[PDB]
Design a protein around this nucleic acid. Sequence first.
DNA 1: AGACACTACGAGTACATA
DNA 2: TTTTTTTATGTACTCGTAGTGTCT
Lengths: 486, 338, 327, 255, 319
Amino acid sequence: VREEDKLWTVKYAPTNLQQVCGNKGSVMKLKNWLANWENSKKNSFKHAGKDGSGVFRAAMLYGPPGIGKTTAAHLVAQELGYDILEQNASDVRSKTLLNAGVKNALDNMSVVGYFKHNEEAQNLNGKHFVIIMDEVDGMSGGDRGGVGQLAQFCRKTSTPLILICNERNLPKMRPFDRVCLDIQFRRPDANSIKSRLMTIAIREKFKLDPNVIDRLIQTTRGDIRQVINLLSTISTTTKTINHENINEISKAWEKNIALKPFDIAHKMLDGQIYSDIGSRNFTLNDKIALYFDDFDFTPLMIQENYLSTRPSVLKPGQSHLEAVAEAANCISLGDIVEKKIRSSEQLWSLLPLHAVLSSVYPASKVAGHMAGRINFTAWLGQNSKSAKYYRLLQEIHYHTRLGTSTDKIGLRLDYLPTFRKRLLDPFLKQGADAISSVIEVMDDYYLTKEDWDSIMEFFVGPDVTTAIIKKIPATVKSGFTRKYNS
Amino acid sequence: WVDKYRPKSLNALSHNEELTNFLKSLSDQPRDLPHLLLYGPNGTGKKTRCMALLESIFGPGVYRLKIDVRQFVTASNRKLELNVVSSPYHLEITPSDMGNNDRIVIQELLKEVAQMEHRYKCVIINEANSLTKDAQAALRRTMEKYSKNIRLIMVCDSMSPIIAPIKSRCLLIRCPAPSDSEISTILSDVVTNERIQLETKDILKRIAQASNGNLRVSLLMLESMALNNELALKSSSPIIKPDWIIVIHKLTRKIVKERSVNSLIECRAVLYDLLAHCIPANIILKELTFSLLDVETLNTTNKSSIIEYSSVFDERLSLGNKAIFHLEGFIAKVMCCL
Amino acid sequence: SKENLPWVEKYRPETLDEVYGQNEVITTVRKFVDEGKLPHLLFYGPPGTGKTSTIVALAREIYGKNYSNMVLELNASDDRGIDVVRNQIKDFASTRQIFSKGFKLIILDEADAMTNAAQNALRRVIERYTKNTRFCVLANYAHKLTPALLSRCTRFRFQPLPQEAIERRIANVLVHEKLKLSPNAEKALIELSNGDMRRVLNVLQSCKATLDNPDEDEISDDVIYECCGAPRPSDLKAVLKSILEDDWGTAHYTLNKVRSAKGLALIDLIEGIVKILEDYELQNEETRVHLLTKLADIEYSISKGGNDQIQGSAVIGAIKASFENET
Amino acid sequence: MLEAKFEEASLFKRIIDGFKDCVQLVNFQCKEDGIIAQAVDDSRVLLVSLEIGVEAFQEYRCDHPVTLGMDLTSLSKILRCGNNTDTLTLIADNTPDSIILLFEDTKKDRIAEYSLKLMDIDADFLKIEELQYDSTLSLPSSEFSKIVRDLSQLSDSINIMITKETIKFVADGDIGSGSVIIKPFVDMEHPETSIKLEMDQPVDLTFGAKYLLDIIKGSSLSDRVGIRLSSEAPALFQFDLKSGFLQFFLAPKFN
Amino acid sequence: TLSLQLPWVEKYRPQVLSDIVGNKETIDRLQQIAKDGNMPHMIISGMPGIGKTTSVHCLAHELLGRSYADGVLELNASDDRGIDVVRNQIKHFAQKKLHLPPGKHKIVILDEADSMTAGAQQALRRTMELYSNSTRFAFACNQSNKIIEPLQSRCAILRYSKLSDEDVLKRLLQIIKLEDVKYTNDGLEAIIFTAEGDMRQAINNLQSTVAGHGLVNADNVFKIVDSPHPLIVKKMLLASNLEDSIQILRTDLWKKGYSSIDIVTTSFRVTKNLAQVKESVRLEMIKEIGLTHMRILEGVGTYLQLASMLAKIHKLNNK
DNA sequence: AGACACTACGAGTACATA
DNA sequence: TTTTTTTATGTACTCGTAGTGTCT
Ligand SMILES: Nc1ncnc2c1ncn2[C@@H]1O[C@H](COP(=O)(O)OP(=O)(O)OP(O)(O)=S)[C@@H](O)[C@H]1O
Ligand SMILES: Nc1ncnc2c1ncn2[C@@H]1O[C@H](COP(=O)(O)OP(=O)(O)OP(O)(O)=S)[C@@H](O)[C@H]1O
Ligand SMILES: Nc1ncnc2c1ncn2[C@@H]1O[C@H](COP(=O)(O)OP(=O)(O)OP(O)(O)=S)[C@@H](O)[C@H]1O
Ligand SMILES: Nc1ncnc2c1ncn2[C@@H]1O[C@H](COP(=O)(O)OP(=O)(O)O)[C@@H](O)[C@H]1O
Ligand SMILES: [Mg+2]
Ligand SMILES: [Mg+2]
Ligand SMILES: [Mg+2]
């Protein structure tokens, strides 16, 4: 092996913790967490401490790629005497063999730490393992991939567990919410990377000035690996870099990453984009690509927060209400288009049209400043709640079908306003001696206690029984529960 | 109660004498009977009349029915669970209990019942309006291929979403809502049998005037207000209105009072709270528009635009799936109109 | 026997000299094959123009009568996925012929229904194996093909069949069959074809069946119009005149009697009136805008059903209100 | 009316298993001299030609030439429905449709009647290839199948080289390379283990691994297989049965 | 006929980085890289037919010399490139021992990298990270957005642009000089006009015109290759009067056999990529084009629908 | 005669779709 | 600042009982 055969990112890789750039707080927190790991296992993780690290036996590092998560993890692993072990998605990771291996390795000692050196007074921890998992977000979605298996692994283990992923808040990563201590590595500061670039430039005889690293890391968006690769790629031809050719370099190395459904909502509802000047800079093709970055949450977010802005593109003689009405009309048209898309015939070739009608046109109608905060779309939770209520109403209707002889909606609209007066009202106006009447009325339609509980949740407006059931004396409720349980 | 006093035969019907005579004529010869489609307002009594007609085609055991369960497998491993109302002479299916999987249940179940078979077994399709166009197309040929073993009696409230082939493949029977006088006479027999105390009979008439021909709603409201007056209705007993109707009325008051985006947010919130509690959006739009037209503050120019926008957004909702996306648009258009 | 196949299948061209209408592409392909440089072909065109017949006759001329063995013909009826490509197409391209010596031919007929992954895998098969095999892609819509795959083949656009070639084929059929055709009947037949030989052959067989005679008589315009159910220009112009000039009730009665005397359809009358009014030199384009918009709306509504009388009255009122702006 | 009766019912099973994987549909031509079949692979890389004379049929009656187009994934299922000590009977009416198989036990009394719906295959299969080859070798079928299955694990292309009394099978892949070299010898103690080779000019050409693995599946028919190679000609892999033969015309890969 | 000749795209395919008339900056960059060595991981993105695959092939050839056969691993979209392949074969090639000069490295060329699955792309990260001192990765794709950001973070990004008129004209002149073809200025101009920055398509059209007529003239080029589809659609949409647009749609598009789906899709794409008119009118035209496409997809695709679409577009442009 | 490595075809589970 | 939205075929993975050639 020679020197010119490795990339600049490998020959300038950090050899110790004192050369990492930025995120000093995170690396110190993880170092303290790994240091007190045996102090945490000797008392079974009950004492968390002042740092709050010690109750969780696993640590999950999450942040953008290329900021030094894996590097810092490996560095602290070699520095604290822990015998390092790495396994990731590049190797086979399933529910069958990965689970078996990790289970056999959670409370087994290392032979490498035993045979290498075990006689000097270095540490009693060399016999231990540190299972460092990389690309945790790269596993398969289902349980067969091993994400839930690893989540359960982070609950029962005698060796420190280190998890490293690039994307944290994902559905697949939901089980890791309350099981492992979360550490977030953030965008590094400009000074440390500036000094590192100064050093790596003076070492390679690369002419470079301090005025350009700011724009460089701005267009790179906090990625030291990409910056190093950029310098290694362009330093071979252009020996001296300055403020003359930096424009072409920034335009050719623009990081094209898809935005989250929250930044997409900010860019869509930005009034400067739709101005006469901003139109010829962020063209309509870019606006459609914005929606195509995430075409599942963009229309919902747009419909949620299109009427929560202050418009700055109002035509002369048009109020905010008119623009909101036109935006809602286009939202309805885009909804019709989406229904035509995600139905039979699979008219997916209409996806670009759904880009304009659902997101682009309503946002353009009410583009401007953001008044409050970008609120997440509540249509998902409302749909889930409506589905649960529909399932409950279906159970109630199929229980009462033997007597009602009506439909689901016909039972919800008209029958429930009378079932409320029949079941619950005798409890408020008669006391605890009206239990038998309610029991007979419920058995007349084969109702259950769970059905009685679910019935009182359908009413709204001036009839909210959530406090009426609490106003009922607890004696009557206990007597009813005991009577129905006999 | 609605269920305690319900006719069980054709001779027990107490309104629409011409319809009862037509049903008797149609049940005189039961074997040469084509498929039937009962259409009319919701709450008229068509589901009782279909069972009464079955009671004339078969023995009295048609009402002794049982609820069973049947499982289906779609193109994926998602298991479709559907309960079936069955009788030793007929069976009832309600394809309105699932999503876009109506075609599978329809075709498979009807083919199983037709291959196993007075001489035929009647089939009652409840709420045929929720039947998707693909399920109706699948039933189109099943109605004709097996006509000697399976006869369909489809109960619906409006033939608008029913396709033309299905309309042609079955006789159409209209059930007009009973007059206020017949509703009053029925409520009289009910209150004399349930031992209610009426200071003046005219209140019963008012019940009819509050039900808009609906007997199911009329009897339920009468019983609900009989529990508030403690089994003794007075001359000025208040009318018991459902909660969602009061919410819609308050929504219209908010609409005519304030027309702005800040009020549009709370309007969207009210729409979400209404939709989350098992309330269809078409009925919400219908009631909202009808009670907005009742606002005396508006003029003919406003009401015409309101009804036009309601028709447009009703078409939108019938062509869409995200109902609030059309409801909020209609509300915003009404706000812009006023 | 060939006497049992329909006229569309019986008269399928077997040689490149029987493919009429396409002359600029046929001569170029013949030159490509004679001189040897045959590139990857992309036959794009409407249905019934003769792309499949052209490529079949080409493969016949190239390999002889054993065409069915030396050519790999895949279509939408066969499973065409990415794995199907990877195995079958690559094994065909990499290997050689089992019957003779020469380049191979892969005819991907109706390749507009292939998956995007299949085309992405095939675009490197066409570029890698290009010294021992060739590719022919037949398409009706050029938007279903990826631009990478679209750029690797030489595109030939099959124009609709013109009057001369379709009349030549009609004369060939009238020679092959004991049948006579009137000149005006032939013109009306060419009018209702839009360059589709399939329709012409089908309706010719149907009107020969309609003759009811031992074919000692001729086929006139009446036979064609009664067999295809198409409206006549006479009734078309009469309805248009009664709509434009006569009274509302009289126009309604005329439309009703015309559409009920011959059992004509409202959509055919709509298309005919659209074709006739296209030659009308009109005033300010607002009338044309209203006419086109309302007629397209009525056509889209007819395409889903409804009341024929209501739609006919709508057509009458739309045409009338559109022409009321021309004054 | 075609009426054939086999001596052993398992011979037809072993014959059809040879085409089961490498051929999908077949078109049996039955004449007064025997049954012929020619089929082309889906990828059209190999051609299967089976010929079985009337010597194999214990009884044979062919009034007129009959064409039976059928599928092999169903014929194999029908054949597996038989028995090891049974006899097979093929019946076809005057018009070819719904061929009938009859399995009859010779030890007990048993009749198994199966039907198979014919299919109308428009493509005719009557081509015969009779041309001199550059080299003709003969080796035990097991010894050839072993080398094929052993070299198929290294790569997807196997190169055959015929030189002056030398037969070389080379396979170069990503995990390494390999080459088996054999010499034609004459074995007097056992004739079925000898290796014969008559060459006119050296040959060097490659095949694919999948088709070569599918070809050696017919090794259960005969104890010795012949290989005829020529300069850019379909290689002839022949298994000779006591009443005819099965020959695979394999097409090499262009270099 | 017995055999064919190699096409001019494959015969005259560049084998040295100097013969590439593509983007000069990236070409000189790759030339200096092959001269000095130490080739890093790279991702070349762009449009079809601009010299991406040829560029990486030339780079690998010049960098490996005679060791190209045993040091370069080519994987196209025609081969299986799933998680199993990346796990077994790519890792075995990266771990393979090979004695190379002290300035070269093993190259893994992955054509059509935008088609690899997410699992394979995720597994390739550590695969290219642990063996980055003896194995280098070169991806060639058309959409850099289809490749995950972790993979893009470990490599250089080379975005190839369209080829200007001068470069394609120079390459065609070189090919004509090497082939002794009779041509004319207007014929080459029409060829370049119908190419639209596509060098492969330009050479293919040139070879087809040569083999079909012999003389490369604008008349021959236009009679064998129709005018570009989007330009006629743009001229139809940008018409000022309704009758002109209707006549254009009738004669150029409908009378030549262009399907209604292709017409409406081209109209949508042109209106999306249009810059002559404002944003709001463009959005309204896109709305009308989509309303028309919703009827075209339902099987109501005729000339009347396109005429009504043009009429509505003109009414929108009618203030 | 038999045991068990090798193996290939079948049900399950998700993941995109311009 | 935070998690689901139908059906429809193509694509990719895995476990998986199963069918058969091989070894103490
Ligand atoms: N803070 C840093 N200071 C100096 N070099 C760094 C830093 N972060 C990353 N690097 C360089 O980037 C290389 C790769 O670092 P990694 O830790 O592997 O990246 P990462 O943050 O783990 O993101 P991944 O690998 O895509 S999950 C190192 O070998 C260094 O050369
Ligand atoms: N140019 C032509 N000359 C003569 N007959 C033709 C011609 N074009 C079509 N036909 C007739 O129409 C039949 C069908 O032709 P095809 O080639 O199958 O149509 P097509 O051009 O392939 O369009 P498709 O198959 O719908 S994509 C042929 O068998 C002929 O009978
Ligand atoms: N810059 C160039 N100079 C000369 N010939 C070129 C150039 N670019 C492309 N060509 C020609 O085009 C052919 C194919 O080029 P490719 O590199 O395969 O196209 P591409 O840029 O990779 O786009 P793809 O493969 O469709 S994603 C080559 O064999 C050359 O004949
Ligand atoms: N002829 C009748 N006389 C008295 N009550 C009737 C009559 N017809 C229907 N009803 C009442 O209608 C109720 C059922 O209504 P239903 O038929 O389910 O409404 P829908 O017609 O909307 O299905 C029963 O409780 C019954 O008391
Ligand atoms: Mg990492
Ligand atoms: Mg065709
Ligand atoms: Mg390429």
